[PDB]
């Protein structure tokens, strides 16, 4: 049956979802997630979107401002908008499934509402695809692939040039923050191949 | 994060083996989520962070995949040019272009709401730091506009059945991430995925560039340029956030280097030590690397050279002989609080003093502070992540290697004094410090072990559970937040694949309103502690025979 979603959990509680089409499959994942980690996911949504202060107060105003200054919601929204229906079905299904459990939670909170919600003084609301996307954006892209210290680096170089002079300053920057080191242990062996490019280590953009 | 993939030429009782330990820090409930999907073209089992649609760690019975952060430099900063007369505009290619901007309002519990504006240019969102009437800085990511494509790529890769299909997906993942591959036939592979800028000639990517136009990226580099290897001669693929490939450049972070001193060598030796490894021996590499002091191998030879000619009764010499007898594998004493050997503390104190005396002294205040950490610093709760060799230490290593370093020592970190003198004096400091805290009988020194904490606040510092939900583990272990292993074509099992993982504290974070914790709220916590693991099921048959519960939903979209 194309409307059927089967959920089986193993001896550790790990869920297995069985479904015919994309939307039902991810609905199923979304359902079990909202069962297992609702508070964690609610607080993760709030973290990735900068809405923590709404529920935790003024100690998180700067946190919230910082999160929002580091992304552009509209661009994330437009990416979702360009998705094929099959790819859209992954985000919509997931969100829809969470919504199904969330609705049973708020219908019968006396027994299904995670205790933390009571402790922290609020209730869970429904999710949209944008929300699922930002979980990933906020905890994978911004946490692990958004790294730079270029402003600081320029300031070190500046200070080194002042202490040691222009040429020696530069040479010392190349000693502390080399572009490449030929002795670095590599995951790919030298016999297999090497990186075709170069790169300038003398600040030629100034 | 670490990962070792073992191929057919090195796998014993199997054709391939994959052991992954991503290091995201430790949290309660668990950072990753276990899930299996069966239908709509997927057939998978594994666990994934924050339950993303796509499993970062898992297999489909045909191939297996894993990840480690890549730390390539995929981010640059453009210094935009502003003017007081055109507030909200910036000069780009001879024209004043209006910035993108939006209004935001932070609602606050039991506080007043605050409104603020966010600004963006063609190069990226503006940094709220380093701001002047003339200049503002924009953060440019090569992955900009491809966030959602990277999520989908990580989902569609789960459907691949060979190297070709899998690289097609790897090509669509734009973040800087190392992806790994293995399959039933014994093939293995690695790809340093991600979008990287094709910079103008002369662009030093460790430093900002003007935003006026001439320094704009030409585009992005093609996938052909992404480092990759399929079935290496070596018969294995090992990574611990080290460099992908010869002459490949690292992140521009001042605190991040790929040099002679790299923790990945520790994995390399254990894999090269024996010609073939079974699955159990591949798993034990976690325990061994978890406990391995990472500085001993790097500086023992220097320490030995400096003390080789001292008399037997010189305490500096005794401290070195102590390290010489040690394998560097830390173990708890029966008290559950101290380490059996004082080697790390010796190293920590010696290294700290060496850096103060060398790298730190050569660098202008207060940048000097960036090179002072020994890499052992922590809190009563323990490290928030992995343990690594510190920037300072890596720089010191190039210096104590002398002529064996390909890095020119523009300035002598030892400032004219012989190295031995400096090494010795650092050992003098170490003996004074340690002998006053522990007394003069090294053999009874009981130094504090590091502990491990599963925090109730997530990485952002935000509560994701109540404070009392925090869990503690006596022994800190330099290992993945989770560990998973996939073994292909095992000779002693009837299935063409076996998999295992551990998701502590448990699969579930649920607590009912009356405070009743879920059946699987804490059942993997002790298993994590003792380097144990539970089976991951894939086939309908395996799943049915280990079922504990079942629910069938009927819905139409
Ligand atoms: C924890 C982090 C790392 O290896 O730096 C990471 C990011 C993405 C995938 C795996 C690990
Ligand atoms: Ca850069």
XYZ file of C-alpha atoms and ligand atoms in Angstrom:
775
model
C 0.000 0.000 0.000
C 1.435 3.338 -1.079
C 0.006 5.105 2.013
C 1.616 2.685 4.434
C 4.755 3.402 6.451
C 6.139 0.655 8.610
C 8.338 1.462 11.585
C 10.332 -1.263 13.333
C 12.721 -0.625 16.147
C 15.491 -3.029 17.149
C 16.876 -4.016 20.538
C 18.520 -0.638 20.902
C 15.484 1.393 19.863
C 16.998 2.177 16.487
C 14.252 2.778 13.973
C 13.901 1.242 10.526
C 11.413 2.852 8.177
C 9.747 0.958 5.320
C 7.865 2.919 2.617
C 7.111 2.943 -1.091
C 7.734 6.536 -2.081
C 10.100 9.327 -1.128
C 7.602 11.500 0.869
C 6.344 8.574 2.944
C 9.914 7.370 3.665
C 11.128 10.684 5.074
C 7.783 11.245 6.851
C 8.652 8.058 8.663
C 12.145 9.215 9.580
C 10.687 12.548 10.725
C 8.080 10.791 12.883
C 10.507 8.624 14.795
C 12.906 11.578 15.219
C 10.209 13.652 16.870
C 9.612 10.679 19.111
C 13.270 10.292 20.085
C 14.673 13.778 20.127
C 12.000 16.432 20.077
C 13.478 18.708 22.761
C 16.952 18.334 21.291
C 15.700 19.143 17.769
C 13.560 22.056 18.964
C 16.546 23.541 20.699
C 18.713 22.825 17.695
C 16.243 24.688 15.437
C 16.372 27.596 17.785
C 20.169 27.505 17.807
C 20.479 27.375 14.054
C 18.012 30.186 13.567
C 18.839 32.501 16.477
C 15.609 32.209 18.412
C 16.969 30.907 21.735
C 16.447 34.094 23.743
C 12.642 33.914 23.063
C 12.584 31.018 25.476
C 15.810 31.333 27.499
C 16.195 35.076 27.981
C 18.711 37.897 27.685
C 21.783 35.770 28.227
C 21.272 34.628 24.595
C 20.600 37.932 22.805
C 24.183 38.212 21.481
C 24.121 34.524 20.559
C 20.918 35.093 18.582
C 22.269 38.204 16.823
C 25.459 36.346 15.933
C 23.604 33.404 14.356
C 21.440 35.626 12.221
C 24.387 37.727 11.010
C 26.107 34.605 9.698
C 23.446 33.455 7.166
C 20.819 34.731 4.718
C 17.420 32.982 5.194
C 16.001 34.083 1.867
C 18.815 32.415 -0.059
C 18.246 29.194 1.813
C 14.547 29.545 1.000
C 15.233 30.052 -2.702
C 17.429 26.901 -2.858
C 14.568 24.893 -1.424
C 12.280 26.538 -4.034
C 14.459 25.365 -6.907
C 14.307 21.694 -5.818
C 12.761 19.033 -8.022
C 9.590 17.471 -6.557
C 11.522 14.317 -5.589
C 14.189 16.280 -3.748
C 11.476 18.555 -2.232
C 9.678 15.477 -1.091
C 12.632 14.671 1.169
C 12.362 17.908 3.088
C 8.563 18.151 3.071
C 8.130 14.515 4.091
C 10.572 14.778 6.970
C 8.941 17.929 8.271
C 5.425 16.494 7.763
C 6.266 13.409 9.812
C 7.622 15.415 12.679
C 4.465 17.466 12.468
C 2.322 14.333 12.883
C 3.962 13.427 16.138
C 4.118 16.993 17.287
C 0.397 17.257 16.865
C -0.228 14.128 19.022
C 2.102 15.621 21.639
C 0.152 18.823 21.973
C -3.090 16.936 21.888
C -2.084 14.722 24.860
C 0.689 16.579 26.699
C -0.228 14.996 30.040
C 1.570 11.908 28.768
C 3.512 12.657 25.560
C 5.179 16.085 26.136
C 8.934 15.706 26.871
C 9.568 16.841 30.432
C 12.088 19.473 29.377
C 9.262 21.434 27.749
C 7.549 21.708 31.045
C 10.767 22.559 32.782
C 11.700 25.220 30.273
C 8.236 26.771 30.084
C 7.015 26.410 26.483
C 5.519 24.036 23.898
C 6.746 22.717 20.565
C 5.451 24.119 17.252
C 5.327 22.659 13.768
C 8.219 22.368 11.337
C 8.666 23.378 7.658
C 11.335 22.244 5.110
C 13.267 25.419 5.783
C 13.620 24.253 9.327
C 15.101 20.895 8.377
C 17.481 22.468 5.941
C 18.813 24.903 8.539
C 19.539 22.139 10.995
C 22.080 20.935 8.450
C 23.184 24.400 7.446
C 23.594 25.540 11.004
C 25.376 22.561 12.455
C 27.423 21.261 9.519
C 28.136 24.114 7.130
C 28.529 26.906 9.710
C 30.175 24.785 12.323
C 32.659 22.912 10.247
C 33.107 24.565 6.817
C 33.048 28.290 7.682
C 36.530 28.865 8.963
C 38.756 31.831 8.355
C 41.194 34.026 10.360
C 42.379 36.228 7.522
C 41.847 39.546 9.390
C 43.909 38.209 12.283
C 46.500 36.728 9.940
C 47.038 40.132 8.292
C 47.437 41.653 11.691
C 50.189 39.142 12.624
C 52.011 39.685 9.382
C 51.774 43.440 9.975
C 53.233 43.128 13.462
C 55.998 40.787 12.208
C 56.968 43.247 9.477
C 57.206 45.933 12.081
C 59.421 43.920 14.420
C 61.626 42.258 11.790
C 61.356 44.493 8.714
C 59.427 43.900 5.484
C 61.269 40.986 3.897
C 62.173 39.125 7.101
C 58.715 39.787 8.488
C 57.235 38.013 5.501
C 59.714 35.167 5.765
C 58.790 34.698 9.445
C 55.048 34.652 8.577
C 55.999 31.893 6.152
C 57.678 30.120 9.029
C 54.656 30.290 11.379
C 51.806 29.918 8.881
C 53.280 28.270 5.797
C 51.095 27.765 2.746
C 52.374 24.239 2.353
C 54.834 21.915 4.086
C 56.267 19.093 1.908
C 56.861 16.882 4.927
C 53.193 16.800 6.010
C 51.932 13.220 6.288
C 49.262 12.817 3.592
C 46.248 10.518 3.289
C 47.208 9.999 -0.329
C 50.766 8.810 -0.954
C 53.168 10.737 -3.222
C 53.319 7.820 -5.691
C 49.614 8.250 -6.375
C 49.573 11.915 -7.292
C 50.133 15.467 -6.077
C 48.176 18.736 -6.156
C 48.626 20.506 -9.512
C 48.462 24.079 -8.201
C 50.720 26.644 -6.615
C 49.669 29.679 -4.547
C 51.483 32.918 -3.676
C 53.095 33.287 -0.223
C 54.272 36.912 -0.427
C 50.961 38.854 -0.150
C 50.757 40.219 -3.709
C 47.232 41.593 -3.261
C 48.601 44.550 -1.283
C 37.897 13.032 13.534
C 39.652 9.899 12.402
C 39.075 7.161 9.846
C 40.954 4.148 8.538
C 39.799 2.216 5.497
C 41.543 -1.123 4.942
C 41.479 -2.745 1.491
C 41.777 -6.335 0.174
C 45.571 -6.419 0.265
C 45.564 -5.614 4.006
C 42.291 -7.047 5.366
C 42.508 -10.414 7.103
C 39.335 -12.599 7.135
C 37.558 -9.979 5.009
C 37.958 -7.962 1.784
C 37.586 -4.476 3.269
C 37.149 -2.688 6.572
C 36.062 0.803 7.560
C 36.391 2.312 11.040
C 35.243 5.955 11.549
C 35.407 8.175 14.637
C 34.094 11.653 13.984
C 34.944 13.977 16.850
C 32.105 16.484 17.375
C 32.459 16.748 21.149
C 30.293 14.849 23.683
C 26.628 15.585 24.437
C 23.452 14.257 26.030
C 21.318 13.279 24.319
C 23.688 11.776 21.696
C 25.076 13.982 18.936
C 24.133 11.414 16.278
C 20.930 9.537 15.490
C 20.535 5.886 14.355
C 18.245 5.253 11.462
C 17.628 2.777 8.666
C 15.679 3.516 5.480
C 14.205 0.927 3.132
C 12.194 2.030 0.098
C 12.129 4.721 -2.636
C 15.537 3.542 -3.825
C 17.288 3.478 -0.459
C 18.419 0.524 1.640
C 20.548 1.821 4.455
C 21.568 1.535 8.113
C 23.873 3.771 10.235
C 23.755 6.968 12.327
C 23.891 10.675 11.482
C 24.266 14.039 13.231
C 21.042 15.850 14.266
C 19.223 13.245 12.208
C 19.958 14.844 8.852
C 18.016 13.181 6.000
C 21.349 11.835 4.818
C 23.461 9.444 6.917
C 27.069 10.581 7.235
C 28.027 7.176 8.624
C 26.523 4.053 7.155
C 26.201 1.462 4.483
C 23.769 0.004 1.935
C 25.087 -3.572 1.805
C 27.057 -2.825 -1.308
C 29.254 0.125 -0.350
C 29.951 1.896 2.922
C 30.702 5.629 3.474
C 32.244 7.881 6.147
C 33.553 11.410 6.738
C 36.172 13.606 8.418
C 36.256 17.392 8.218
C 38.623 18.386 5.419
C 40.003 21.749 6.560
C 40.801 22.987 3.066
C 40.725 26.758 2.595
C 37.308 27.387 1.076
C 36.709 30.818 2.648
C 38.205 34.262 1.905
C 37.573 37.785 3.116
C 36.989 40.777 0.848
C 37.592 44.278 2.223
C 34.694 46.285 0.831
C 34.982 50.002 0.192
C 32.339 52.248 1.744
C 31.638 55.975 1.870
C 29.916 58.154 4.420
C 27.920 59.722 1.618
C 26.306 56.570 0.364
C 25.345 54.727 3.538
C 24.622 51.115 2.652
C 26.493 51.110 -0.657
C 29.926 49.766 -1.674
C 32.215 50.216 -4.681
C 32.380 47.190 -7.022
C 33.758 47.270 -10.573
C 33.574 51.071 -10.796
C 30.028 51.419 -9.478
C 28.277 52.035 -6.179
C 26.198 48.949 -5.509
C 23.515 48.861 -2.910
C 24.074 46.255 -0.205
C 21.468 43.677 0.598
C 20.009 44.246 4.037
C 17.246 42.879 6.201
C 15.661 43.765 9.565
C 15.626 41.275 12.413
C 13.979 41.361 15.824
C 15.170 39.254 18.710
C 12.244 38.546 20.979
C 13.430 37.939 24.522
C 11.939 35.968 27.405
C 11.346 38.322 30.336
C 13.185 41.044 28.498
C 12.725 43.726 25.890
C 12.818 42.972 22.177
C 15.790 44.266 20.157
C 15.868 45.132 16.457
C 19.029 45.099 14.314
C 20.075 45.094 10.644
C 22.086 42.478 8.782
C 24.136 43.490 5.740
C 25.374 41.517 2.688
C 27.400 42.181 -0.494
C 28.086 40.158 -3.644
C 30.930 38.626 -1.632
C 28.931 37.511 1.447
C 27.446 38.758 4.717
C 29.243 41.628 6.442
C 31.276 40.899 9.607
C 30.159 42.787 12.719
C 33.811 43.204 13.564
C 36.717 45.313 12.204
C 34.400 48.092 11.111
C 35.358 51.591 9.959
C 33.718 54.498 8.120
C 35.701 53.476 5.009
C 35.799 49.647 5.213
C 33.655 46.613 6.107
C 34.571 42.960 5.635
C 32.561 40.328 3.756
C 33.006 36.578 4.293
C 33.109 34.642 1.064
C 32.439 30.914 1.055
C 33.013 28.827 -2.053
C 29.944 26.781 -1.007
C 27.692 29.831 -0.945
C 24.401 29.000 -2.587
C 25.099 25.249 -2.428
C 24.121 24.433 1.167
C 20.980 22.568 0.167
C 22.775 20.766 -2.673
C 25.317 19.469 -0.152
C 22.560 18.059 2.053
C 20.994 16.275 -0.963
C 24.339 15.058 -2.192
C 24.901 13.444 1.219
C 21.464 11.786 0.836
C 21.770 10.555 -2.761
C 25.277 9.104 -2.241
C 23.611 6.450 -0.049
C 22.106 4.950 -3.211
C 25.476 4.416 -4.991
C 26.664 0.913 -5.895
C 30.136 1.630 -7.183
C 32.919 4.194 -7.301
C 31.534 5.975 -10.388
C 28.079 6.559 -8.933
C 29.481 7.600 -5.580
C 31.909 10.193 -6.979
C 29.071 11.693 -8.987
C 27.490 12.526 -5.652
C 30.771 13.468 -4.039
C 31.113 16.089 -6.755
C 27.884 17.797 -5.561
C 28.908 18.108 -1.929
C 30.264 21.664 -1.665
C 31.518 21.819 1.963
C 35.182 21.008 2.761
C 34.791 17.392 3.850
C 36.785 14.203 3.428
C 34.487 11.394 2.189
C 35.547 7.703 2.236
C 34.388 4.640 0.296
C 34.494 0.831 0.628
C 32.592 -2.131 -1.039
C 31.803 -5.918 -0.934
C 34.496 -6.569 -3.510
C 37.226 -5.064 -1.368
C 37.682 -1.768 -3.224
C 38.369 1.392 -1.147
C 38.490 5.089 -1.897
C 38.864 8.628 -0.644
C 37.873 12.067 -1.941
C 38.582 15.445 -0.381
C 35.212 16.878 -1.447
C 34.123 20.494 -1.630
C 33.959 23.651 -3.658
C 37.237 25.616 -3.819
C 37.861 29.035 -5.376
C 39.821 29.453 -8.564
C 41.729 32.548 -7.339
C 43.395 35.293 -9.388
C 47.111 34.873 -9.830
C 48.858 36.400 -6.837
C 45.977 35.889 -4.397
C 47.503 34.821 -1.032
C 44.528 33.069 0.570
C 45.830 33.512 4.097
C 45.068 37.222 3.821
C 42.101 39.448 2.870
C 41.805 40.870 -0.635
C 40.120 44.070 -1.936
C 36.460 43.886 -2.725
C 36.502 46.468 -5.527
C 36.456 43.815 -8.230
C 39.910 42.876 -9.497
C 40.474 40.305 -6.876
C 37.203 38.519 -7.313
C 37.440 34.763 -7.685
C 37.409 33.601 -11.376
C 35.015 30.839 -10.421
C 35.308 27.501 -8.709
C 37.837 24.722 -9.544
C 36.540 21.516 -11.199
C 36.160 18.214 -9.363
C 39.229 16.883 -11.247
C 41.277 19.066 -8.932
C 39.787 17.597 -5.737
C 42.319 15.176 -4.279
C 41.166 11.567 -4.602
C 42.470 8.022 -4.780
C 40.889 4.644 -5.614
C 42.635 1.482 -4.380
C 45.999 2.933 -3.294
C 49.211 0.851 -3.516
C 49.545 1.138 0.228
C 46.333 -0.868 0.732
C 44.843 1.563 3.267
C 43.512 5.109 3.653
C 44.075 6.891 6.981
C 43.107 10.437 7.995
C 42.957 12.396 11.261
C 42.249 15.891 9.816
C 45.678 15.756 8.212
C 46.547 16.714 4.693
C 44.862 14.967 1.781
C 47.747 15.115 -0.661
C 51.249 16.245 -1.399
C 51.387 20.071 -1.727
C 47.731 20.543 -0.882
C 47.128 23.716 1.102
C 45.304 23.897 4.454
C 42.687 26.186 5.971
C 43.977 29.751 6.490
C 43.367 29.491 10.295
C 46.465 30.681 12.179
C 45.929 27.927 14.632
C 45.832 25.219 11.919
C 48.791 23.541 10.198
C 49.704 20.421 8.214
C 53.363 19.779 8.911
C 55.941 17.193 9.847
C 54.219 16.713 13.190
C 50.798 15.235 12.672
C 48.693 12.920 14.731
C 47.811 10.818 11.723
C 51.242 9.197 11.883
C 49.987 7.364 14.952
C 47.394 5.491 12.862
C 49.840 4.885 10.065
C 52.282 2.999 12.289
C 49.682 0.660 13.717
C 48.436 -0.140 10.217
C 51.921 -0.649 8.785
C 53.088 -2.626 11.776
C 51.351 -5.893 10.640
C 50.851 -6.939 6.998
C 47.129 -7.752 7.409
C 44.549 -6.753 10.052
C 41.312 -8.503 11.030
C 38.193 -6.525 11.973
C 38.858 -6.900 15.696
C 42.374 -5.511 15.266
C 41.011 -2.605 13.201
C 38.549 -1.796 15.933
C 41.322 -1.932 18.597
C 43.094 0.936 16.803
C 40.423 3.147 18.423
C 41.402 2.157 21.924
C 45.091 2.523 21.099
C 44.846 5.937 19.413
C 42.338 7.042 22.142
C 45.005 6.678 24.773
C 48.150 7.657 22.781
C 50.063 10.672 23.960
C 50.678 12.590 20.747
C 53.747 14.617 21.759
C 56.051 11.809 22.965
C 56.996 10.554 19.500
C 57.674 14.068 18.277
C 60.015 15.262 20.976
C 61.601 12.188 22.634
C 64.608 12.131 20.256
C 65.390 15.825 21.032
C 64.925 15.104 24.674
C 67.272 12.168 24.430
C 69.985 14.131 22.548
C 69.985 16.892 25.105
C 70.365 14.496 28.060
C 72.564 11.804 26.432
C 75.726 13.004 28.143
C 74.483 13.915 31.616
C 75.384 11.807 34.651
C 73.049 9.167 35.948
C 71.916 11.348 38.927
C 70.794 14.389 36.933
C 67.008 14.680 37.420
C 66.519 16.116 33.943
C 68.029 12.887 32.757
C 65.738 10.805 34.941
C 62.681 12.534 33.525
C 63.849 11.661 30.016
C 64.617 8.036 30.881
C 61.090 7.795 32.316
C 59.680 8.829 28.901
C 62.074 6.503 27.080
C 60.606 3.460 28.885
C 57.048 4.555 28.094
C 54.973 3.550 25.118
C 52.871 6.687 25.570
C 49.630 4.771 26.057
C 47.864 6.319 29.061
C 45.954 4.012 31.438
C 43.881 4.744 34.552
C 45.107 3.642 37.962
C 42.711 1.532 40.031
C 41.505 4.766 41.676
C 39.693 5.835 38.517
C 41.272 9.325 38.835
C 45.019 9.112 37.997
C 47.265 7.936 35.217
C 49.708 5.046 35.742
C 52.562 6.969 34.212
C 53.312 10.713 34.617
C 54.494 11.107 31.048
C 51.809 13.441 29.760
C 52.282 15.807 32.709
C 56.017 15.758 32.109
C 55.425 16.540 28.506
C 52.828 19.162 29.186
C 55.057 21.104 31.538
C 58.163 20.684 29.422
C 56.361 21.708 26.259
C 54.698 24.696 27.868
C 58.030 26.043 29.024
C 59.688 25.364 25.627
C 57.063 27.334 23.819
C 57.358 30.205 26.256
C 61.122 30.165 25.608
C 60.974 29.857 21.824
C 57.965 30.456 19.630
C 56.244 32.799 22.113
C 59.382 34.928 22.549
C 59.856 35.351 18.827
C 56.333 36.644 18.229
C 54.980 40.143 19.010
C 52.474 40.591 21.776
C 49.776 39.695 21.892
C 49.858 37.392 18.873
C 52.455 35.565 20.912
C 49.622 34.087 22.960
C 48.500 32.136 19.898
C 51.590 29.919 20.177
C 51.666 29.206 23.940
C 49.222 26.292 24.418
C 50.826 22.942 24.892
C 47.692 21.175 23.753
C 46.968 19.614 27.195
C 44.839 22.460 28.628
C 41.420 21.462 29.927
C 38.749 21.905 32.616
C 37.452 19.712 35.412
C 34.910 18.412 32.884
C 37.634 17.554 30.358
C 38.268 18.413 26.734
C 35.353 19.593 24.664
C 36.834 17.820 21.666
C 39.768 15.919 20.333
C 43.342 16.343 21.456
C 45.892 17.452 18.907
C 49.473 18.702 18.646
C 49.271 22.477 19.162
C 50.236 25.043 16.549
C 53.147 26.013 18.714
C 54.356 22.485 19.066
C 54.189 21.916 15.309
C 56.308 24.980 14.756
C 58.720 23.913 17.454
C 59.020 20.524 15.720
C 60.205 22.011 12.483
C 62.837 23.826 14.539
C 64.183 20.793 16.494
C 64.410 18.821 13.263
C 67.048 21.280 12.107
C 68.095 20.584 8.546
C 65.536 17.803 8.185
C 62.766 20.443 8.031
C 61.924 21.814 4.615
C 60.771 24.957 6.410
C 63.324 27.797 6.444
C 63.936 29.071 9.961
C 63.833 32.746 9.000
C 64.373 33.485 12.703
C 66.053 31.110 15.151
C 63.368 30.222 17.653
C 66.266 29.411 19.967
C 67.771 32.942 19.534
C 71.451 31.987 19.360
C 71.572 29.548 22.247
C 72.259 25.945 21.513
C 69.067 23.895 21.442
C 70.300 21.495 24.089
C 70.714 24.366 26.602
C 67.101 25.447 26.006
C 65.742 21.896 26.137
C 67.606 21.340 29.392
C 66.393 24.489 31.031
C 62.867 23.562 30.099
C 63.544 20.200 31.784
C 64.862 22.050 34.882
C 61.572 23.946 35.056
C 59.673 20.698 34.672
C 61.475 19.006 37.471
C 61.005 21.955 39.886
C 57.271 22.249 39.057
C 56.524 18.565 39.201
C 58.817 17.592 42.123
C 57.163 20.230 44.376
C 53.661 18.986 43.661
C 54.431 15.277 43.719
C 57.703 15.114 45.645
C 60.992 13.630 44.494
C 59.996 9.994 43.863
C 58.786 9.811 40.291
C 57.811 6.163 40.598
C 54.941 7.140 42.931
C 53.689 10.168 41.056
C 49.949 9.935 40.532
C 49.011 12.512 37.997
C 45.439 13.525 37.225
C 43.838 11.743 34.299
C 41.599 13.637 31.942
C 37.898 12.879 32.216
C 35.044 12.958 29.667
C 31.657 14.693 29.905
C 28.497 14.259 27.816
C 27.210 17.847 28.095
C 23.527 18.956 28.327
C 24.282 22.054 26.341
C 24.915 21.506 22.619
C 28.016 22.862 20.788
C 26.435 26.284 20.488
C 26.350 26.455 24.291
C 22.567 26.087 24.293
C 20.619 23.776 26.560
C 19.383 20.709 24.688
C 18.383 18.981 27.927
C 18.284 19.837 31.650
C 21.514 20.302 33.544
C 21.146 17.046 35.494
C 21.120 15.093 32.258
C 24.834 15.580 31.904
C 26.793 12.301 32.115
C 30.426 11.711 33.096
C 32.993 9.101 32.183
C 36.212 8.729 34.218
C 38.550 8.101 31.298
C 38.913 10.722 28.621
C 39.349 8.977 25.266
C 40.687 10.761 22.155
C 38.169 9.140 19.914
C 34.990 9.685 17.962
C 31.816 10.979 19.546
C 30.531 7.784 17.945
C 32.456 4.958 16.304
C 31.181 2.743 13.534
C 32.812 -0.103 11.578
C 31.649 -1.788 8.375
C 33.306 -5.075 7.355
C 32.789 -6.318 3.820
C 32.720 -9.969 2.749
C 33.685 -11.338 6.188
C 34.850 -14.947 5.777
C 33.257 -16.090 9.066
C 29.692 -14.872 8.554
C 26.840 -15.810 6.196
C 26.049 -12.251 5.179
C 28.199 -10.371 2.647
C 28.566 -7.536 5.199
C 28.652 -6.850 8.934
C 28.358 -3.442 10.693
C 28.605 -2.075 14.236
C 28.286 1.276 15.982
C 27.809 2.914 19.374
C 25.563 5.914 19.996
C 25.922 7.059 23.575
C 24.277 7.670 25.815
C 21.451 6.090 23.830
C 19.133 6.246 20.844
C 16.424 8.061 22.813
C 16.436 11.375 24.652
C 12.839 11.065 25.839
C 11.624 11.626 29.358
C 7.912 11.475 30.062
C 6.229 14.306 32.032
C 6.439 12.354 35.268
C 10.210 12.040 34.892
C 10.247 8.443 33.602
C 13.261 8.066 31.364
C 12.955 6.000 28.155
C 14.072 2.389 27.843
C 16.865 3.521 25.518
C 17.876 6.717 27.291
C 21.115 5.311 28.658
C 21.771 1.795 27.318
C 24.881 2.570 25.235
C 26.684 4.613 27.789
C 28.726 1.822 29.369
C 29.266 0.229 26.021
C 31.011 3.480 24.873
C 33.214 3.515 27.993
C 34.586 -0.037 27.419
C 35.179 0.171 23.682
C 32.160 -2.050 23.043
C 29.712 -1.940 20.089
C 26.263 -3.142 18.978
C 25.288 -4.570 15.575
C 23.711 -2.475 12.901
C 21.083 -4.403 10.953
C 20.332 -4.012 7.267
C 18.262 -6.895 5.817
C 14.589 -7.326 6.461
C 15.569 -10.663 7.910
C 18.079 -9.269 10.358
C 15.726 -6.449 11.347
C 12.729 -8.760 11.973
C 14.660 -11.115 14.177
C 15.871 -8.273 16.414
C 12.578 -6.369 16.489
C 11.363 -5.067 19.859
C 8.421 -3.004 18.544
C 6.521 -2.078 15.403
C 3.973 0.548 14.284
C 2.268 0.890 10.897
C 1.068 4.301 9.706
C -1.393 5.092 6.901
C -1.186 8.543 5.361
C -1.653 10.262 2.061
C 0.048 13.467 1.080
C 33.885 16.706 13.791
C 34.272 17.292 12.421
C 35.776 17.195 12.211
O 36.301 16.012 11.611
O 36.574 18.346 12.302
C 33.585 16.582 11.332
C 32.857 17.302 10.391
C 32.186 16.658 9.364
C 32.204 15.282 9.304
C 32.904 14.548 10.258
C 33.612 15.194 11.257
Ca 41.270 32.093 2.850
